Structure formats: structure tokens, C-alpha cells
Design a protein around this ligand. Structure first.
Ligand SMILES: Nc1ncnc2c1ncn2[C@@H]1O[C@H](COP(=O)(O)OP(=O)(O)OP(=O)(O)O)[C@@H](O)[C@H]1O
Ligand SMILES: Nc1ncnc2c1ncn2[C@@H]1O[C@H](COP(=O)(O)OP(=O)(O)OP(=O)(O)O)[C@@H](O)[C@H]1O
Ligand SMILES: Nc1ncnc2c1ncn2[C@@H]1O[C@H](COP(=O)(O)OP(=O)(O)O)[C@@H](O)[C@H]1O
Lengths: 501, 479, 178, 478, 70
């Protein structure tokens, strides 16, 4: 195909063009230095307009003075002549949105960086669409699943609830993020893995894992090369938020993974510093609080009046040396719906995932998880907190009471239940099974280190023998006496099978 | 005229110009209007703090910076901002500028009090000291509130402060027949929404028929600009002020968080051409807290009891905003990450939390001995626990070995469940009476119930229920 | 709202209240004509040379070139308050500040052909209709890169700008590939 | 040919150059300055723009010593970005920041050259295979597998053994696998640059005569260099590596050390650029420059550019942003704790943070995965017992915890890999171990085969059979 | 960037420079906000001399820079 057919579409695009009377604001660029463009003239420019240069590296006008306008370079403009006619576009950072994004690695200027081809799109969603209203929205009353055992058990996520994964680096945070993405395989959950400011080899690895898992059919990965300009590198979560608003506003509940947010804060810091906007504490600009507030508040749960969808958020925040008293992990814990920690101690000490409930917390609770697991083990979170204290207390183990001996061995076997293999997303019915196996003390007399083998034997035994349990309870969400009977029955049988042997 | 231009807009700071005929005073509301991105008639309200020469002025905006472009008109109202106040302004949730954000019909806006006013002098302050019981065990024991005082929740990194506010509102809103007002000051919007849902549920808002709701909801968003959050506390304070002078009833305030207010003020003051201060904040922190905690004062005309949550960043006390907030507080309750880590809720550090209304002559000279004895053995336990963690309780000598187990029972016993926290715990909570509290503690500190297991005191409302749970635990020890 | 802009505003406003409007206009024209040469500008811009000699030279130039006492007093205040190092942008913005206070809207309409002066007056009336300005100081210059159409540029300095010359091709090459 | 003109300002290293008002140069492109000197007016003053700063004036960064030239010198715009010689002309030649051969050899042929920087390689041009090759150092091969084609980070402070570890790694993989092997020295001790140069000459990987058979392009940048020179040598070395992965299409070895000096040069030039500071000292743009120098290192569809980069952690601060960007930007973190070197193990590598995503069952085998697990579990437990055993002594533990401490110190002193290049430093001629030893020494330690030989009986010996022979020798000498 | 960057004081200045004298009697505000004020004039003001404000809300002056007293 060469010089044969497209001339008719060429004539279609030429004849029928605009020839507009569009008066535009146009600015003679004065001061470009290091990713910014302090531009002379350009009076009636809306703060937030894309500003078209000579090149095509457009830019947002963040600050503006009586003489100059603080304009960033989304796309680094490596050659911009002084005095170039840099006019704005009028519109305000709008984002084209469609369901055909479902799989394409997309850049922050809505551009497919997948290699799959350009996307047709109708709407033009704003980059700073505000949060949904106070009265308009419902409490997070409906469960959403992780596939990981411990978060579901103690510190649940709900559809609309914005739990904050947090911790030091290299402790599986992106891993548990992808795990709770590809858990969603039949839950009608769009995931938006917004990758921010890390290795493109890493984002290629995670999209490789998504292609392998099949989960890339519905998820939208917003990649960010670390070589991207810091304006784009902080802009991209707002694009991901508006793109998830596109699906939440229909009826469709969705999930988002900012990854990370600390690089967003740092890139935004760099832009604010080059803009000469004065810094607040820890050399950051003060309003990273405001930036992350506008980000995470655009992620909530709709009500029946507007579609009852949800935008449950998971902004991973990087904190160095296990600190909490760093500035951005101090802002985001105030503006999130509870936080979970990935301690290096608990990760390298085998607990994988490493969410110690002593510091991790989910601040909306069991109403955001299923009623069956609720009626089983609502109390188990505080029980494990007491076990963690008493096991710290059982360092002084000389003559332990028999009741606290039962308690420590109980919570010991419980903590051993909360170990799970790499990327094994258990059925939520199976999580109910293991949590009842723990809370009913069958494993108490059993072997304490073979509990993982007991559990895999038990889950295979029930998933073979009595799978009717799983369907009746997943159709009722309620721990009834039928569930009890099927559970204790398969428990007797597999307890026999693993006693012998 | 008074129509001027906006010369510089940098963040939510708006450098407004004016012709030399008129340059308005400070604190005055300006409203750029009629324009948005969609050609909408969208208005943005903006008040002024600094006026930087040449008849021009840098303003802070109570709504988002999008929409308005430099070289636009401004309409000053010739006055400071005025908040619609009244009994008609109960019930509905509304804005910092007063606009009803409940999205149904607006409240009748005919009585608008100015948002910035004088603080009542102490000749007007009701010097009457009084005692308040709120039904939560460790509070009415060790940090007993003043029915009329100022009440602070020094909270940690999102631990028990807002759920404590919900519990306490649930317990005392029905109790106080006078009016009430919740101030959402940079609160999390979905948790304020959950609070609003609980007010619809418990009928304190009375969703089917309003203006009989003795509580009044006002909220300002986290996602709103710091120009909004810098004055939403002033909005709530002025609604309570109107109810404290004009209505002059018993008024209850529940603002959350005051540190959000501080952070917004610091945030915008960094931008509006002003130097920083010591860590965190603006140099105007002390005067901000002065305006607030001098206007929330129980007057001889009308009482008020303003309770408030204080989120300290990094969960400490040397932080300057709680260094002045303690100086402006009278009933301080300080939560602890450690007691939250051990699940004990409310995770109060009873060593840290005290009150002015813990005088022996004002609590009862036996209640005071109860409180002193529990604080003594508890502080000694917190003193001992480090040596415990290196040398063993069983080594640590007997005359303190009984006391460590005693206070270890004590703290978990004063962990008591809440009627809303049952979603987080499993068992529905309990409204505990202070006589029951001092009775159970007179058992424990004396050492009558030293036979009980410690986890029998875990998460229990009454000491009778603690004995019942103890018998249940002994029963399961046999079974 | 720079320092040069506000000193320009002070000078234009004292000219406006004293009625020395066009006198100070032509006076700053001859003043920037004098400041065009870098020896005298460098003489005033150097802080090393003595202030009384600078004042005597300044008043000498004032008396010889026959200037307004208002702008004379102004530039005496400038050499006193040290802002005489900024005289280039001071006067270069004072002309536009005077144009603002006199409402005269400088609109540089470049094109490829020297348009009919009646058409200049026509678009002058049109842009006075769209602006409300007193005068529209129509400015033209032949631009070869503009293909055929009129290319206005108005507003404060160069803010608002309409073209009909390369904008047709630019619209076509933009909207075709979408 | 292009815009000539005058420099208007010079501020130490940084220079502000005015120009004709018509055409200003690009941003990030280079331009020389003629200037002056003592004898002759050489073009030694090469320069590079950074910020066009009003009034037809650019604010630019220099590359050489900035003494003797003045404002008003005859600046020459070369228009293009900084070209640099590439190709087989690089091979063996120890050339410098602008590409000129400072190895006292001939000026290399400019028939193949490339600009200094380019865009990031593509989302698709990233590779897919999680490649792994061993080295020979057993702590790495146990618990920090190396993503070849990815990025291999060497952390630690000073005096903790990082350039020595780099010398050992290059001592292995100079004659091991991998095609052309470009070393770059960013802020290197130049005596140690020529030291490793002489080590490559003696080991013969570079070639004395017919130098174009070397598969090594040692483009050092000495630590003595001006801040612009240190700010550009990393881009030079990466330009060589990307040229080879695109034109040689080769698996290119990219030893660089240490890019903290690179971003420190960026900080000290920003402080004269007048860009406002950032966290504790550095430039505000450290994230973006590290993003450039990392995102332009990738394994292509044909060239697995394996980079062994070092980062000088300043005063052992992991909270510091110069780590805190890099160990997000790389795959194999290898932090070298100083206190281990104080104890005396060489290399001094903790296991707890020295990690990788290559430590994965579906990459290294589930067997090697759980091997590294059963190491790391024990050593993390040893640390969480260490911080309370140092106070109040040894025997307050259980029998189990005492045995676990003994076995964890067994693994620790067993990881004391003797280095083949460290013979001239300590005395012991180093040893080489592989994957069979990697499984088996662990296996004997964790099973309890070696469970009575003392802590010296696996000290400074890699192979566990060598440890057994050492145990035999020390038991014989009694 | 300079002090007295207000031009109204400078209008008065360029109107009435033509002498070599001061303004010492009283003055006007030149800048005000957050409970402080940078005011012009009344040049003889002692270090810590009280200042009779407009609307009587008096205060003490400590910054007493060249064209503007704080
Ligand atoms: N349940 C698990 N079992 C075993 N290993 C796990 C588990 N979860 C995570 N990991 C491991 O954690 C390692 C680090 O993963 P990941 O990159 O997500 O950590 P991180 O802290 O997010 O690092 P970064 O922030 O740099 O991406 C992975 O190599 C993975 O093997
Ligand atoms: N593997 C090793 N074996 C023996 N000695 C070592 C080893 N590594 C380092 N040393 C000791 O450290 C000194 C060299 O410094 P070291 O290699 O520790 O840090 P470095 O790599 O030089 O770091 P930098 O180059 O950033 O300063 C030598 O004097 C040597 O005695
Ligand atoms: N021991 C506990 N008792 C009750 N709630 C707890 C406890 N530990 C953690 N929480 C969680 O903490 C949350 C309340 O934290 P709080 O400080 O009140 O609000 P915020 O987190 O918004 O500041 C609750 O929603 C609950 O899920």
C-alpha cells in the first residue's frame, strides 16, 4: 500500500476544514531554563492551559506574574528560540477517554506508548475535575478483594475505600499491587496501574506479568519513564485519576494503583523549585499535601444516584529507613483511608506480605468486607495485636501461664496461617476457610510448622470434596451453620489425612 | 468602582490590583465571577490578608484556582465575609462561604454574621468551672472534661481521634439539649460523609424534617484550597459564636482537624510573600490559635464547649503547633501509637493526657485518689517496661512485679468498646458510668481482682462484664 | 508591575494630572533618543562616577535640550534613587505605559503586502470595537513568511494575535492527521 | 559557521554568553569558546549551554578549566549537541570528556561520531527476558542475583569496598562473557583509573599494539575535572554503550563508578546556576538527571546493556536522595555496610537490603530461591537478636536462638569471599566459586554438616571444601 | 523590588523634589498587613518611638528603613 487510496480521505480532511475566526492569546517566550518557560506577554492565559510552542512540546502554565507566566515543558523542549510565538490552546489539560484504552500502555499526554495503535476517543475529561460531593456519596459498604490473605483478613479494602500501601523500598510493594490487580479477574474491576518515575524495564516486567496473567486485557497502565520531564512525571497520576473517573462515572467500579507517589511529590517539587515557588519544610513545596489531596479525593465510592461505582485507590508511598516521620508519608497518612506497612523485618523474616497489624490499619473496617468473614473473625485483628505484644512479652519466657501459653501458641499458629506463597491469590471462600480453621482452634493441637501443608491439604480437600460450600457462601456472603458443618466435616477428614500422615 | 484586575495568580494566592480610588481593607471577601472553563457563570470567592502596595493586594481564594485568568474583574463586597447563621442554618451541610452543599434547597440566608469578629474578653467569659461526664471510661476517670471548657484530642497518625469524635458525638449530642455544631475543618470527606450518615441514622440530623436538628454540619474539604481551609474553621466558629451570643444556648463544637487549619495557614503564608518559621508552619501560628481559642470561650451570656481533634505530624509534642495548642487547651487527651499497636482503644497516653478539671475537690476526694493511684502504678509500669524488655519480668522484683501485672490489667481494662467501633472490633460497645469505672478500678488498684486473667479485662465496658468474661475464659481453659 | 513599569506609571500619572501628557511623550521620545548612545547611558549607569557630576550633567542636558521640568525632576529622582541603571527598560516601558493611560492600543498588524490604508482604518475601527480603546496605534511591517493573509497582533504587548496567512496551512496540516 | 559572538559573564565554572539577537542556539547543545591562554588561543574551552537567560543571552556550563578567558571572548556556536567519537576508535583508547584521546595516542578518526545525549529508548525497545549471569562472588550469587541487561547498583560509603568490588567484577567479566565492555569513570580517583587501566593492559583485555581489538572503551573522567566535565562523562560513557548496543548490537558491560559524583557535580553547578536548592544540599533536578542516566540504560531487543553502577552513599545515609532515587532506578541493590568492614569481612555486604527482583523462584529455580530465603530468614533474625544481644551478653538466649546465632555467623563469615585482585592488598590469593558451591556451602551450613568447626574455619574462603580443608589445617595446628 | 515601590510616594516625590530637604512632620502608610505596616515618612522617629496610627490603633516602630518605616 503506497500512493493508492488515501487521497480521498486527504480531500475529505482538507475540504471541510475550519478557517476559524479564533482570536488566541499568544506569547513571546522570554525565559526558558531547565524545563520551565517564563514567557513574556501572554496576558489572558488560564493557569492550567496547555501552551503550544514552536516545537510541539506543549506546556502547562502553572504560575503567572504581572509580567511573566510560569510555564512548564511537558515534553522537554530542547530547542526553543527566544521570542517564539508560544500561544496557548485555550482548553484546560483535557484528556480523551475510552474503553479502548483497556490494555494500552498510555503516556500522560493520553498517548499510547504500547505500540498497539492510536485510540479513538470522544470525551475530553479535565485534569482537575474535583471530588464528588459530600452528600452525594455513600459509605464504603461493599467488599473488594485483594487475593492476599492478611490484608483481607485484618485490614480490609473496600470498593471506594482508599487504602494506602506504604513501606520501605524493595519489600514487595509493587508485587502486592500487581497481585491485588490480577486478583480481579471476574469482579468487573478496572485497574489503573499508574506507574510513576521508576524503571521502564520494571514497567515492562509488570506488563509482561500482566500479559502472562491475562490481566492486561482490562487494565490501563500509565507508564512514566524516569527520563520524562518532571511536569509529566507528576502530571500522570491526575491523568490516571480522570481516566478512572471516566469509568466510575458510568456505573463501573474501578481500582487505581499509583506507583509510586513519592516520585510524584519529588517531580512536583522539582517543577515548583524551578518555578521559584518557595519551598515549605523538608525542602519540599508545602502543597504536596494539596496535590495529593486533590489526587486521592478524586477517588471514592459513588452512590445509587450517580452510578454506585467506586475508585478504590492504592497510592504506594516510598519511605526511607522505615520512617513514618518523613514529610510525604506524613501527608498521605493524614489524607488516606488507613495505611498498611511493609516492614523489611517482616518481609525478610518470612511474613510475605509483611503487614504487621501493630502499625498497619484500615480505618473504615469490616463493613468494607464480607459478612461471612465478619461473623467468623472480626476479633482476630485485635487478637493478633495482643499476640504480637505478648510474643514481644514472651521474650521473658521462664514460667509462662498456661492460659497465655495457649494464647501465644494460638496466635503463633495464626501468624503461620498469615503466610502465603508467591502470587497465590486465594479464593475469598478459601480465606474464610483458613480464618475459621484458625479461629476454631483445630490447628491448636496440630503441628505448628506444618500449618501451610495442613492448609494446602485442607483447601484441596474441600475444593475437591465440598465445593458446594464455596458457592452457597459466595451467594450468601454469610457464615451459616451449613458452612460451619461443611467446614468442620472436611476439617475432620483432612486432619485425619494429615495425621496419617 | 470597585472593579480591579488580578495581576498575579500563583497557586491559590491572587495578587489583585485596584484603581487608586478604592483599595479595600483586610479580610474582605472578593468574588471573581461569571467565568469558568465552560464559559460558565462560575464564581470564586477570595479574601485578602496582605495588601502589597500600589493600591494592589494579594488575596487567598476559598475555591479552586482553575477558571480565573489574570486581568479579570473582582467584586469586593465592601465588608469582611459574612456567614449565614441561624436555626435555619442547622441541619444542612454548607460551605465556608456559606453555600449549602447539601445540593437540595438552600437555607434561608437573612442573618449573616461576619466571619472575622472580636474575641470575647474574660469579663464576658463564664469563669464558672464545671464538670462533664461523657461516658467513655478513661476520659471520665483521668481526663474529666469541663462542661464549658475547651477539649483537645491530641491524636497520632490516624489512630483513634476521629472514631473517638464519632463515639463522643453519639454519646453526648442526645445528652446536651442545647445546640450543637460539627466543624469539618479539612476533614477526610468520606469519613465526614460517614459521620453525616451516622447523623442521618441516629436522627440527630432528622433527615425527614430539619431545623429541629440541634446539630449543625459545616465541612471544608481537604481537596479544597488552603484558602478555603484557612477560614472554614472560622466559619464553624462563627456559627457556634452566633449560637453562643444570639441564641446563647449550650453549644457543642467538634472541629477536626485544627492542624489542618494550621497547615493551610502555613501553606498559603509560604506563598503570599512571607518568611517561614520553625518546623512546619507560618510565623502567624500563635495568632491563628489565639483568634480561635479566644473566640471559643464559654461566655457569661452563653455557654460553649468546643471539643477538637489535634493531629500532630510525626506523632510528637515538640512540634510547634501542638506546642501552642496545648497552651491553648484545657482538656487534653493524647493518643499513643504504642497503645494503638497493642490494640488498646482509645489509645490514650494517660501519663500525657491530663485536665484542669482533675482537681480533688472538684472530682471527689476518693475519685482523685483513684486517679492518682492508677496514674502512679501506670507511670511506674511505663518506667519499668524497658528494664523488663532486657531483664525479664520474672527477675523484676516482686514489689514491682505485682504492680506491672496490675497496671497491665489496668490499661486493657480502660480499653472499652464503642457503639460505632463494633465494625472494627466485633462486639457492640458500651456506655460506661463513672461510678462503675471507679468501682472496677478500686478493685484492680487495690488488688482484689488480681486473680482474674489480664485478657479478661480486654475490651470490656463493665468490671462485672469483666468478671463474666473471666468466668468464660476459665470455662474455656477447662474446655 | 515591575519597578520600571511602576516608575513609568508614576511619571505618566504626574503628566496626566499636570496636563503635560504629549509634552512628556515627545520628551521621553527625545530622552530615549539621547539614551540610545551607550557613552552617556554608561556614564549614568556607572555608580563609580560622582553623583554631583552626574546631576550636573543631567540638568545640563535638560537645560540644553529644553525638556519638561516634570521629566527632568523625574530623572533627577532616578539618579538619586539609583534606578538610573534601568533607564532602557524604564523608558521603553514608559512609552507603553503612556499609551495605556492614553488608551492608545498599539496593534502590530504585519502581513506580506503593504495593505490599503483604508483597510488599515477598517480593521482599526474593528479592533477599537473589540477593545474599547481610545486610539489603535496601527503598526505594519512586511513579513515574508506570512503567505497572504492579514496577521494582527494586539492586546497589551503581543498577547492577542490573529492570522490568515500560514494559519490556513497550519489548520490543514494539523486537522488532517487527526 | 554558526552564530559567533561574545560571552557576557563568567562565574567560576559557569558562564553566561550573549549572542546576536536573531538566532540563539539550542538548549542542551554544545559550543566551543576560543578565548585565550598563555601560549596560543586554543579551543580547549569547550562549553555547553544550560539556560537561555534573557537579553539574547544563554547561561552555559563549561567543560574544562575556566581560567584565563574573560567575558567578550570570541565564542563559536557549533550548533549541534556535543559530538563524541564512537566506534572501534573507542576500543582501548582512554579518551576524555569531549572524546579526545588523552591516552597519549593518536587522535581517533571522526568518521563515526554521535551527539552526547539522546531521547529515552522505547517502551517496546525494552527487552523481555529477565537475564541472569553469575559473577563468582558468593554473597552476590547467593542473595543478590544480577539482572544482566538491567542495572546493577553498588552502594555504600567510602572505605567500604566498592571500587575494589568493581575491580574484582571487571577482573572476572573482562575475560568472561559479554562482548564490548565499556568502563566509565565518573569522579574516579585518576591514579586508580590508570591502575585499572594497567590491570587491563597486563591482563591483556585491552591491546597494546593494534588497539582496535580490545572490546573495552575505558572512558574515564577523573575526579579532578571541573563540574561540567564530571556532569558529562557519564553521558559520554552511556553514549558509547548505547552506540555499541545499537551498532555493534552487543551485550555491553557498563562498569561505572560512581554516579553520586555525577549528581554532586550537578548540584554544585546548579548552585551557581541560581536554581534554588533541594533536599539537604543537592540540585532540584537530581531526579530527572538520574532518570536520564538510568532510562538511557536498558537491555535493548539486541543489546543487553548490563550496567554495574556505583553510588557513593554520603556518610552512610540511605535516607539521602542520592541513594533514594538510584535504588528505585536500578535492579540489584548492593549496599555495603561499613560496620561489616569494621569487623573485617571483605566484601562487607549486608544481606538485608542488598537484594534484587532476580531473587525470584521462576528465575533462579525455586531451589535457589528458597536457598537465598533460608539464608535471609536466619540473618534477619540474627540482626533482630543482635540489637539486644550486644547489650546483656550471649547466653540469655534460648538454646535454639544461640544455635541460630552461631549458624547465622557461620553464613556471615562464610560469605567472606577472598578476592583475586585483593591478593596485593591483603595477601591471600583469591578464589572463584559458582552455583554448585552456592547451593552446597549453604546446604552444609543449614543442614548442620559443618556444625562444629569454628568461626575462622570458613573465614576468608569461598569454597566450602576449601573451608573444610582450612578447618583440617587449623585443627591440625593445635 | 526596591523600597517605596508604590509610585504614589514617587508621584509626590517627582512633583516636589525640588529642594534638598526631608519629610519629618508626619507620614503615610506605604505597606500594611498581618498586624505590621511598612509606612513612609516622619523621618525623625526614635528607635521604638510610639506611632500614632490612623484610627488610633497605635503601635511601635522598629524597622525604620530609608524610604519606609516598619
Ligand atoms: N508474597 C511474597 N512472597 C515472596 N516474595 C515476595 C512476596 N511479595 C513480594 N515479594 C518479593 O519482593 C520483591 C521486591 O518487589 P517490589 O519491587 O514490589 O518491592 P518494592 O518495595 O515495591 O520495590 P520498588 O519500590 O523498588 O519497586 C520481589 O522480588 C518479590 O519477589
Ligand atoms: N575486598 C577487599 N579486600 C581487602 N581490603 C579491602 C577490600 N575492599 C576494600 N578494602 C580496603 O579498603 C581500602 C580501599 O577503599 P574501599 O575499596 O573500601 O572503598 P572504595 O571502593 O575506595 O570507595 P570509594 O572509591 O568510593 O572511596 C583499601 O585500603 C583496602 O585496604
Ligand atoms: N484499637 C482500635 N479501636 C478502634 N479503632 C481502631 C483501633 N485501631 C485502629 N482503629 C482504626 O482507626 C480508625 C480511626 O482513626 P482516627 O484517628 O479516629 O481517624 P483518622 O484515622 O481519620 O485520623 C478507625 O476507623 C479504625 O478502623
Amino acid at each position: 500500500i503506497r500512493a493508492d487510496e488515501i487521497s480521498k480521505i486527504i480531500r475529505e480532511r482538507i475540504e471541510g476544514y475550519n478557517r476559524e475566526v479564533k482570536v488566541v492569546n499568544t506569547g513571546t517566550v522570554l525565559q526558558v531554563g531547565d524545563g520551565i518557560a517564563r514567557i513574556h506577554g501572554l496576558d489572558e492565559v488560564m493557569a492550567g492551559e496547555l501552551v503550544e510552542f514552536e516545537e510541539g512540546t506543549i506546556g502547562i502554565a502553572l504560575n503567572l506574574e504581572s509580567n511573566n507566566v510560569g510555564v512548564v515543558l511537558m515534553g522537554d523542549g530542547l530547542m526553543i528560540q527566544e521570542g517564539s510565538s508560544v500561544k496557548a490552546t485555550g482548553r484546560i489539560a483535557q484528556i480523551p477517554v475510552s474503553e479502548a484504552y483497556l490494555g494500552r500502555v498510555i503516556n500522560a499526554l493520553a498517548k499510547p506508548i504500547d505500540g498497539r495503535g492510536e485510540i479513538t476517543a470522544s470525551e475530553s475529561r479535565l485534569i482537575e475535575s474535583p471530588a464528588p460531593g459530600i452528600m452525594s456519596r455513600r459509605s464504603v459498604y461493599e467488599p473488594l478483594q485483594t487475593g492476599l490473605i492478611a490484608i483481607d483478613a485484618m485490614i480490609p479494602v473496600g470498593r471506594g475505600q482508599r487504602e494506602l500501601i506504604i513501606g520501605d523500598r524493595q519489600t514487595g510493594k509493587t508485587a502486592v499491587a500487581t497481585d491485588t490487580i490480577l486478583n480481579q479477574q471476574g469482579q468487573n474491576v478496572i485497574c489503573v496501574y499508574v506507574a510513576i518515575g521508576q524503571k521502564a524495564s520494571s514497567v515492562a516486567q509488570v506488563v509482561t506479568n500482566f500479559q502472562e496473567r491475562g490481566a492486561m486485557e482490562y487494565t490501563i497502565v500509565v507508564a512514566e519513564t524516569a527520563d520524562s520531564p518532571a511536569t509529566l512525571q507528576y502530571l500522570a497520576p491526575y491523568t490516571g485519576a480522570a481516566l478512572a473517573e471516566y469509568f466510575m462515572y458510568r456505573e463501573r467500579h474501578t481500582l487505581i494503583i499509583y506507583d509510586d507517589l513519592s516520585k510524584q511529590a519529588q517531580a512536583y517539587r522539582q517543577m515548583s523549585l524551578l518555578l521559584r515557588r518557595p519551598p515549605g519544610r523538608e525542602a519540599y513545596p508545602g502543597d504536596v499535601f494539596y496535590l495529593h489531596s486533590r489526587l486521592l479525593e478524586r477517588a471514592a465510592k459513588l452512590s445509587s444516584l450517580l452510578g454506585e461505582g467506586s475508585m478504590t485507590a492504592l497510592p504506594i508511598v516510598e519511605t526511607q529507613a522505615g520512617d513514618v516521620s518523613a514529610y510525604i508519608p506524613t501527608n498521605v497518612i493524614s489524607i488516606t483511608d488507613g495505611q498498611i506497612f511493609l516492614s523489611a523485618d517482616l518481609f525478610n523474616a518470612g511474613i510475605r506480605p509483611a503487614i504487621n497489624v501493630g502499625i498497619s490499619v484500615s480505618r473504615v473496617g469490616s463493613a468494607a468486607q464480607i459478612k461471612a468473614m465478619k461473623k467468623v473473625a472480626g476479633k482476630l485483628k485485635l487478637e493478633l495485636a495482643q499476640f504480637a505484644e505478648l510474643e514481644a512479652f514472651a521474650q521473658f519466657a521462664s514460667d509462662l501461664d498456661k492460659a497465655t501459653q495457649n494464647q501465644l501458641a494460638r496466635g503463633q499458629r495464626l501468624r503461620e496461617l498469615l503466610k502465603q506463597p508467591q502470587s497465590a491469590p486465594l479464593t475469598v471462600e478459601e480465606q474464610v476457610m483458613t480464618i475459621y480453621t484458625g479461629t476454631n482452634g483445630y490447628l491448636d493441637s496440630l503441628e505448628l510448622d506444618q500449618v501451610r501443608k495442613y492448609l494446602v491439604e485442607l483447601r484441596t480437600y474441600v475444593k475437591t470434596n465440598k465445593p458446594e460450600f464455596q458457592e452457597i457462601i459466595s451467594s450468601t456472603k454469610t457464615f451459616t451453620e451449613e458452612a460451619e458443618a461443611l467446614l468442620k466435616e472436611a476439617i475432620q477428614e483432612q486432619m485425619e489425612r494429615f495425621l496419617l500422615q | 468602582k470597585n472593579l480591579g484586575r488580578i495581576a498575579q495568580i500563583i497557586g491559590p494566592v491572587l495578587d489583585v490590583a485596584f484603581p487608586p480610588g478604592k483599595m479595600p481593607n483586610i479580610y474582605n471577601a472578593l468574588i471573581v465571577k461569571g467565568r469558568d472553563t465552560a464559559g460558565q457563570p462560575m464564581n470564586v470567592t477570595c479574601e485578602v490578608q496582605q495588601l502589597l502596595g500600589n493600591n494592589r493586594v494579594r488575596a487567598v481564594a476559598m475555591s479552586a484556582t482553575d477558571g480565573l485568568t489574570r486581568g479579570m474583574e473582582v467584586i469586593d463586597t465592601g465588608a469582611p465575609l459574612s456567614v449565614p447563621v441561624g436555626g435555619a442554618t442547622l441541619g444542612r451541610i454548607f460551605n465556608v462561604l456559606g453555600e449549602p452543599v447539601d445540593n437540595l434547597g438552600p437555607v434561608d440566608t437573612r442573618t449573616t454574621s461576619p466571619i472575622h469578629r472580636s474575641a470575647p474578653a474574660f469579663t464576658q467569659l463564664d469563669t464558672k468551672l464545671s464538670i462533664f461526664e461523657t461516658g467513655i471510661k478513661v476520659v471520665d476517670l483521668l481526663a474529666p472534661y469541663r462542661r464549658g471548657g475547651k477539649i483537645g484530642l491530641f491524636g497520632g497518625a490516624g489512630v483513634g481521634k476521629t472514631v473517638l469524635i464519632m463515639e463522643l458525638i453519639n454519646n453526648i449530642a442526645k445528652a446536651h439539649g442545647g445546640v450543637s455544631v460539627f466543624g469539618g475543618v479539612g476533614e477526610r470527606t468520606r469519613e465526614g460523609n460517614d459521620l453525616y450518615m451516622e447523623m442521618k441514622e441516629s436522627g440527630v440530623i432528622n433527615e425527614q424534617n430539619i431545623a429541629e436538628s440541634k446539630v449543625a454540619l459545616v465541612y471544608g474539604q481537604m481537596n479544597e484550597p488552603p484558602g478555603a481551609r484557612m477560614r472554614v474553621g472560622l466559619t464553624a466558629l462563627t456559627m457556634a459564636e452566633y449560637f453562643r451570643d444570639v441564641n446563647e444556648q449550650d453549644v457543642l463544637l467538634f472541629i477536626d482537624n485544627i492542624f489542618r487549619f494550621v497547615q493551610a495557614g502555613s501553606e498559603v503564608s509560604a506563598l503570599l510573600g512571607r518568611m517561614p518559621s520553625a518546623v512546619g508552619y507560618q510565623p502567624t501560628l500563635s495568632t491563628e490559635m489565639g483568634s480561635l481559642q479566644e473566640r471559643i470561650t464559654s461566655t457569661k451570656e452563653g455557654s460553649i464547649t468546643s471539643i477538637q481533634a489535634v493531629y500532630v505530624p510525626a506523632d510528637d509534642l515538640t512540634d510547634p503547633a501542638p506546642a501552642t495548642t496545648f497552651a491553648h487547651l484545657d482538656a487534653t487527651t493524647v493518643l499513643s501509637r504504642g497503645l494503638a499497636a497493642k490494640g488498646i482503644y482509645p489509645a490514650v497516653d494517660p501519663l500525657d493526657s491530663t485536665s484542669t478539671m482533675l482537681q480533688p475537690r472538684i472530682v471527689g476526694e476518693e475519685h482523685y485518689e483513684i486517679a492518682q493511684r492508677v496514674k502512679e502504678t501506670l507511670q511506674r509500669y511505663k518506667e519499668l517496661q524497658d528494664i523488663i524488655a532486657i531483664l525479664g519480668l520474672d527477675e523484676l522484683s516482686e514489689e514491682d512485679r505485682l504492680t506491672v501485672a496490675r497496671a497491665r490489667k489496668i490499661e486493657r481494662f480502660l480499653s472499652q468498646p464503642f457503639f460505632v467501633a463494633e465494625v472494627f472490633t466485633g462486639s457492640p460497645g458500651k456506655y460506661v458510668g463513672l461510678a462503675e469505672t471507679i468501682r472496677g478500678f478500686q478493685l484492680i488498684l487495690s488488688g482484689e481482682l488480681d486473680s482474674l486473667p489480664e485478657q479478661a479485662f480486654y475490651l470490656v465496658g463493665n468490671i462485672d462484664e469483666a468478671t463474666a468474661k473471666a468466668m468464660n475464659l476459665e470455662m474455656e481453659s477447662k474446655l | 508591575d515591575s519597578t520600571a513599569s511602576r516608575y513609568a506609571s508614576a511619571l505618566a500619572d504626574v503628566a496626566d494630572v499636570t496636563g503635560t501628557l504629549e509634552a512628556t511623550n515627545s520628551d521621553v521620545e527625545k530622552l530615549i533618543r539621547i539614551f540610545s548612545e551607550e557613552p552617556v547611558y554608561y556614564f549614568f549607569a556607572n555608580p563609580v562616577i560622582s553623583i554631583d557630576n552626574k546631576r550636573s550633567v543631567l540638568d545640563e542636558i535638560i537645560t540644553t535640550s529644553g525638556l519638561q521640568p516634570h521629566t527632568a525632576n523625574f530623572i533627577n529622582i532616578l539618579i538619586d534613587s539609583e534606578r538610573i541603571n534601568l533607564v532602557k527598560e524604564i523608558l521603553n516601558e514608559f512609552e507603553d505605559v503612556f499609551n495605556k493611560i492614553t488608551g492608545t492600543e498599539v496593534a502590530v498588524v504585519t502581513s506580506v503586502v503593504k495593505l490599503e490604508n483604508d483597510h488599515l482604518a477598517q480593521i482599526a475601527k474593528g479592533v477599537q470595537k473589540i477593545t474599547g480603546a481610545k486610539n489603535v496605534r496601527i503598526k505594519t511591517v512586511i513579513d515574508p513568511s506570512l503567505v497572504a493573509g492579514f496577521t494582527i497582533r494586539y492586546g497589551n504587548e503581543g498577547s492577542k494575535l490573529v492570522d490568515m496567512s500560514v494559519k490556513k496551512q497550519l489548520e490543514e496540516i494539523a486537522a488532517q492527521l487527526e
